[PDB]
């Protein structure tokens, strides 16, 4: 029995990752990144990755919600606006189709003095009001919860963050260009911290993400069933140009002694409908590539058709994004209507604007977005989309794919698919019969003996990220100390390698030494004898270095 500390092996594990790099995803509570993207390729290591069971996604989701909520903490809560509104439509030169979208409403508003009221008005979108009992309306959210306005001074720009591992842990990265959602990745590397990932929130189309390698990739937990989303990643960008063409005037209304409401004062010029322009030729070519790949799973000779979204209200059935700070809900019908048989003319999608939103699809709370003065235009590149299959009859063909993606997590699964978090576990035991971090992981047990110091050195190594940092630091220290206490008891303190006075009990393994040390890696070795670790550890604590101290 010989003991080795600093052995380059690991087990899958879940822990807290730390963000590293005003916006709502404030970087105040964030660690600056080291400019050096330290990375070590693992020459002979094959690891199983699983995009669908990756808890890195879940932490990203909950951290984002927390940051979002904290950013609205100091903002004005609009409780005074739950009043009867008296109102009509707007008078202007309007697009004939865009009717009823805007209301011109007046109301009894409070002032900075308790004893005085004022009469004010603001324009509203139809989507944000409810007709109640001639011209009586109310804000839709007063039914369930008064809401805070977004602070006028914070940005919704999705500035990317990186997730870094704590001491004792590492992130493995899959470099296999053809890797689908799951299985053994033949080329594995390792990093201290992930690439920067933008917290872009959208639906039905994936915006500003990473692109695929030369082929469009299709990933699914179970391509066979229909209850799972199919994520499709483009190997090319598709450019979309969106706009909100009306010139709006912003008006500030005092609410109270330190509070103000941002009203829509008026509209300058003709009233036009918001819309997005998609390159038509690009979109068509792109779908042809998607179809080619989908046929690989549904038969060489088959038909693929696309259809628009199905029933739901708004947030469910339409595309969504934040452009310029406005919230757009677009009717992507012109993108998903085609049939693909076996063997500049931009597409224009109409789109609506809404000020009151139920972010993260939660209830009991919401956010009111203030109006933006002027005219909005922005561009983006979609890098993928979310599809669902409908069904069949077994006696026909032409599966239909429809857009979908109700969850938010699918937006981040798409980036984090290349990563996995593991825990580093030294104190390997092997018989002798009494370079880079993890660079030797793919090498033999014998060869690996030369990097024990490398591994050992990486084991100890207002604010949201408060308790999380203290907990991570404490844990790393406790793990370190527990290993040292054990080595101490065993009489191996201060030595990377030590020899016990216990001969190897062959009942634990029956191999020749030359068959171990020159053939197996430590990962393999641990797998063969992990069943007996506790036996050895137990015996070594009392048989020796306790009984021996009376001698």
């Amino acid at each position: 029995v010989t003991v080795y500390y600093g052995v380059p092996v690991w087990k899958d594990a879940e822990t807290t990752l730390f963000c590293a790099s005003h916006n709502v995803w404030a970087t105040h509570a964030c660690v600056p990144t080291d400019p050096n993207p330290q990375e070590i390729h693992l020459e002979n290591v094959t690891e199983e990755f699983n995009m669908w069971k990756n808890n890195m996604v879940e932490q990203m989701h909950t951290d984002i919600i927390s940051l979002w909520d904290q950013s609205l903490k100091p903002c004005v809560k609009l409780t005074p606006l739950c009043v009867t509104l008296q109102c009509t439509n707007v008078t202007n030169n309007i697009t004939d189709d865009m009717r009823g979208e805007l209301k011109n409403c007046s109301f009894n508003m409070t002032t900075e003095l308790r004893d005085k009221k004022q009469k004010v008005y603001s324009l509203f979108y139809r989507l944000d009001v409810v007709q109640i009992n001639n011209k009586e309306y109310r804000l839709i959210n007063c039914n369930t919860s008064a809401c805070t306005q977004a602070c006028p001074k914070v940005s919704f720009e999705p500035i990317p963050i990186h997730y870094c591992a704590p001491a004792g842990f590492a992130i493995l990265k899959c470099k296999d260009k053809k890797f689908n959602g799951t299985g053994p990745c033949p080329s594995v590397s390792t990093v201290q911290c992930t690439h920067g990932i933008k917290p872009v929130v959208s639906t039905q189309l994936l915006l500003n993400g990473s692109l695929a390698e030369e082929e469009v990739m299709i990933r699914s937990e179970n391509i066979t069933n229909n209850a799972k989303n199919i994520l499709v990643q483009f190997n090319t960008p598709v450019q979309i140009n969106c706009t909100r063409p009306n010139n709006y005037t912003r008006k500030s209304i005092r609410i109270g002694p330190g509070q103000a409401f941002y009203a829509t004062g008026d509209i300058i010029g003709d009233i036009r409908q918001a819309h997005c322009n998609v390159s038509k030729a690009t979109w068509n070519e792109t779908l042809g590539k998607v179809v080619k790949q989908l046929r690989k799973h549904f038969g060489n000779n088959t038909i693929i058709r696309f259809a628009n979204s199905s029933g739901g209200d708004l947030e469910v059935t339409t595309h969504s994004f934040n452009c310029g700070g406005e919230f757009f809900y677009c009717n992507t019908s012109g993108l998903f209507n085609s049939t693909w048989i076996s063997n500049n003319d931009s597409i224009t999608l109409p789109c609506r604007i809404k000020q009151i939103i139920n972010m993260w699809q939660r209830i009991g709370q919401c956010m009111y977005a203030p109006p933006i003065q002027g005219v909005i235009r922005c561009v983006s590149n979609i890098t993928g989309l979310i599809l669902t299959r409908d069904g069949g009859s077994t006696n026909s063909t032409t599966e239909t794919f429809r857009p979908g993606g109700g969850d938010m997590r699918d937006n981040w699964r798409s980036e984090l698919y290349k990563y996995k978090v593991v825990k580093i576990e030294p104190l390997g035991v092997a018989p002798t019969r009494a370079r880079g971090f993890l660079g030797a992981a793919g090498s033999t047990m014998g060869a690996a003996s030369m990097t024990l110091t490398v591994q050992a050195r990486n084991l100890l190594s207002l604010t949201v990220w408060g308790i999380k940092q203290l907990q991570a630091r404490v844990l790393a220290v406790e793990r370190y100390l527990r290993d040292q206490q054990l080595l101490g008891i065993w009489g191996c303190s201060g030595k990377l390698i030590c020899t016990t006075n216990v001969p190897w009990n062959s009942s634990w393994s029956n191999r020749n030494l030359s068959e171990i040390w020159d053939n197996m890696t430590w990962l393999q070795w641990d797998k063969e004898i992990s069943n007996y670790t506790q036996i050895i550890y137990g015996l070594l604590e009392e048989s020796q270095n306790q009984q021996e101290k009376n001698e």
């Epitope: 179970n222 066979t224 069933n225 229909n226 209850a227 799973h297 549904f298 669902t388 299959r389 409908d390 069904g391 069949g392 009859s393 077994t394 063909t397 599966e399 109700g406």
Partner: antibody, heavy 119, light 108 residues
Framework: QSLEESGGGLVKPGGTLTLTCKAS?????????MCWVRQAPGKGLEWVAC???????TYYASWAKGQFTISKTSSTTVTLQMTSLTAADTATYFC????????????????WGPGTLVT | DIVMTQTPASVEADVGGTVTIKCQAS??????VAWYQHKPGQPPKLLII???DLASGVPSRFSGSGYGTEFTLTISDLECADAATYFC???????????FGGGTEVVV
């Protein structure tokens, strides 16, 4: 084109009856299962147990898992052994065939027998 | 692991009228609903494939739609011949398995 079934009737509690289901001729080596469905006397339908008409893997309702067993017996028939029937098992039992959709795991019943009673 | 439920346990209309049946699912199902017509003394007859296509052999009286968590069946131009119990089901084989609704009755 049709399913026929029998072997029910009254057995005193704790006894066993076996139901059989006979096809008039169906494809027993393809993307179909054959499955027992129970109609409690006054309720809608309950799932009992299915067998793939292929490899022969079986699935059992959890309530039926420790009591009922099924197996393919021939190229025309499949049977259900209702081990230890009791008062609670009084019902019309039906034989049905299920199809898939295209490439799926979601099934689609498409053929039913007339059903038979046990007490 | 799911229950399909139906609300309009019993409906009645005169001949030529229209009734609807609403089936609520416990989880997101894309469109996988069968809708069988069942008369006593008879095996159930399939009306719908995929919650909206019609089964071969039924009149264009039967129609329906939905896209998860809720599906409906509409029966127009009712005749006494249509009096029956109507089913709702998801039919999955595996862990989250087969489920049927209570069934509703249409009287004409």
């Amino acid at each position: 084109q049709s399913l026929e079934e029998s072997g029910g009737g009254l057995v005193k509690p704790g006894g066993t009856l076996t139901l059989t289901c006979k096809a008039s001729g169906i494809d027993f080596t393809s993307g179909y299962d054959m499955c027992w469905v129970r109609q409690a006397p006054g309720k809608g339908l309950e799932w009992v147990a299915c067998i793939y008409l292929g490899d022969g893997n079986t699935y059992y309702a959890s309530w039926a898992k420790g009591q009922f067993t099924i197996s393919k017996t021939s190229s025309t028939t499949v049977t259900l052994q209702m081990t230890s029937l009791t008062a609670a098992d009084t019902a019309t039992y039906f034989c049905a065939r299920f199809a898939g959709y295209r490439y799926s795991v979601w099934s689609y019943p498409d053929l039913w027998g007339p059903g038979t009673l046990v007490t | 692991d799911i229950v399909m439920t139906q609300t309009p346990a019993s409906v009645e209309a005169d001949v030529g009228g229209t009734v609807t049946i609403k089936c609520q699912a416990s989880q997101r199902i894309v469109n996988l609903v069968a809708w069988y017509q069942h008369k006593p003394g008879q095996p159930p007859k399939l009306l719908i494939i995929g919650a909206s296509d019609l089964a071969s052999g039924v009149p264009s009286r039967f129609s329906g739609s939905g896209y998860g968590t809720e599906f409906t069946l509409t029966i127009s131009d009712l005749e006494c011949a249509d009096a029956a119990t109507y089913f709702c089901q998801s039919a999955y084989n595996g862990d989250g398995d087969n489920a049927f609704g209570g069934g509703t009755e249409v009287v004409v």
